[PDB]
Paper text:
The VH1-2-derived bNAb IOMA directed to the CD4-binding site of the HIV-1 envelope glycoprotein is of interest because, unlike the better-known VH1-2-derived VRC01-class bNAbs, it does not require a rare short light chain complementarity-determining region 3 (CDRL3).
The cryo-EM complex was reconstructed to a ∼4.0 Å resolution, and we also determined crystal structures of the unliganded ACS101 and ACS124 Fabs at 2.2 Å and 1.7 Å resolution, respectively. In the CDRL1 of ACS101, two residues are deleted to accommodate the N276 glycan and ACS101 CDRL1 makes contact with the N276 glycan via S29LC. While shorter in length, the ACS101 LC also forms this short α-helix in its CDRL1. This is particularly visible in the crystal structure of the unliganded ACS101 Fab but less so in the more loop-like CDRL1 of ACS101 Fab in complex with AMC009 SOSIP, possibly as a consequence of the lower resolution of the cryo-EM complex compared to the crystal structure of the unliganded ACS101 Fab. CDRL1, CDRL2 and CDRH3 of the liganded ACS101 Fab in complex with AMC009 SOSIP showed subtle conformational differences compared to the unliganded ACS101 Fab, possibly due to the lower resolution of the cryo-EM complex (∼4.0 Å) compared to unliganded ACS101 crystal structure.
Numbering used by the authors:
A (entry chain L): 3 to 9, 11 to 27, 27A, 28 to 94, 96 to 106, 106A, 107 to 210
B (entry chain H): 1 to 52, 52A, 53 to 82, 82A, 82B, 82C, 83 to 100, 100A, ...
The structure:
């Protein structure tokens, strides 16, 4: 119902805009924006399209055009790093997916990906788990896609949220649970990690 | 000053029910709605219902009429959320939030939601305490620096956290990366622990991951052999 981007990136001092689009945006003038730091509760920073609560930095500002609302952060500062949710109403309170905004504090770094096939022990036990370990990527925002041969695979995928390493890059894991037949039946399986417009793909075949 | 305070985290079996409280303070309890919004990990916030703290009138989301019950206690200024017939997809952080403006406007609950309680984590898992299955991750030099190989252990299906992993009884520490666990839809955790070691030692040095799951009193020393 409400569509907003998963992750956004911007350097300090510059400006950027997060877009939220939905049929409910044009209907009412209730679209709002909520800021959420990790481990804490969301907080309103823009409501009724463009109104700003007292105590909120004046750098935040909102607007809408047609069925697309927009939150604009001018003079980006480090404490703006957070999740920003859009809020509207369509026969009930409804929210977007949330946008992870990262204030770049180091160079964008692509992930290292390590892909393990199922253990022969696990296979002989009538189970199969492909393990895709992702590390050393900044910012902490990736999308993982599993492919059987070339066909995408959505069923059986379990992926963690990124976690901050000691070098302040991020790590994450994705697991593809598989039937032994499914594993032996295909030429290969691939773990595709997209990150900041770049992609890293590792592939394993049952004949290895 | 204006504060909403929720109860602690909960762990429930499927089919059970859970009661989360929300203690208000610093404002006229009966002038503002109390909404309830949950946040499943890696998902968008979802509204489930509000209660008029003055009249006790309620309004739930379509997916919750029948299994949800919101009540209010005027004397303790507390709202309670009762969710029945818990499924595994009910796992989420549950927030309460004050409804902006009040019971005077038609959209007097949908103006702004502020403040929010700190949230209460509810975890629906069919699993009582359970020890892990540990499988070997055979060495692979494909995505490691030159001359080294990555090997590890897959700690599959355990509950609850935590799990600790060492290698060779702690003698091997450099190159160890224990990744945070994933909470699967089954309600069970799984994690991996890998270690980058010299590729020449594979045929000489023994590599054992020492997994310790104290909740289930389970310990596993899994030797990781190379696949010749």
């Amino acid at each position: 119902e409400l569509t907003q981007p998963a992750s956004v990136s911007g350097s300090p001092g510059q400006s950027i805009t997060i877009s939220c689009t939905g049929s409910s945006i044009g209907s009412y003038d209730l679209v709002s924006w909520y800021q959420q730091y990790p481990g804490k509760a969301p907080k309103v920073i823009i409501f009724e399209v463009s109104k700003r609560p007292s105590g909120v930095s004046h750098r935040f500002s909102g607007s809408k055009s047609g069925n697309t609302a927009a939150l604009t952060i001018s003079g980006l500062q480090v404490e703006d790093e957070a999740i920003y949710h859009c809020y509207s109403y369509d026969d009930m309170i409804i929210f977007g997916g949330g946008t992870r905004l990262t204030v770049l504090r180091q160079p964008k770094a692509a992930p290292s990906v390590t892909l393990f096939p199922p253990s022969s022990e696990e296979l002989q036990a009538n189970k199969a788990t492909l393990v895709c370990l992702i590390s050393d990527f900044y910012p902490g925002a990736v999308t993982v896609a599993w492919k059987a041969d070339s066909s995408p695979v959505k069923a059986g995928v379990e992926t963690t949220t990124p976690s901050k390493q000691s070098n302040n890059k991020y790590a994450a894991s994705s697991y593809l649970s598989l039937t032994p037949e499914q594993w032996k039946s295909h030429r290969s399986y691939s773990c595709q990690v997209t990150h900041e417009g770049s992609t890293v793909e590792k592939t394993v075949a049952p004949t290895e | 000053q204006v504060q909403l305070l929720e109860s602690g985290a909960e762990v429930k079996k499927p089919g059970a029910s859970v009661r989360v409280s929300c203690e208000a303070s610093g404002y006229t309890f009966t002038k503002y709605f109390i909404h309830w919004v949950r946040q499943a990990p890696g998902h968008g916030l979802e509204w489930i219902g509000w209660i008029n703290t003055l009249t006790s009138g309620v309004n739930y989301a379509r997916n919750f009429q029948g299994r949800l019950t919101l009540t209010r206690d005027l004397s303790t200024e507390t709202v309670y959320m009762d969710l029945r017939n818990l499924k595994s997809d009910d796992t989420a952080v549950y927030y309460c939030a004050r409804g902006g403006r009040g019971y005077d406007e038609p959209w007097g609950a949908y103006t702004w939601l502020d403040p929010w309680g700190q949230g209460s984590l509810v975890t629906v898992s069919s699993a009582s305490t359970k020890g892990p299955s540990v499988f070997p991750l055979a060495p692979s030099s494909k995505s490691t620096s030159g001359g080294t190989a990555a090997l590890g252990c897959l700690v599959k299906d355990y509950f609850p956290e935590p799990v600790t992993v060492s290698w060779n009884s702690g003698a091997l520490t450099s190159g160890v990366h224990t990744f945070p666990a994933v909470l699967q839809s089954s309600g069970l955790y799984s994690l991996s622990s890998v270690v980058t070691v010299p590729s020449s030692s594979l045929g000489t040095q023994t590599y054992i991951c020492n997994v310790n799951h104290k909740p289930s009193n389970t310990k596993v020393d899994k030797r990781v052999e190379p696949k010749s």
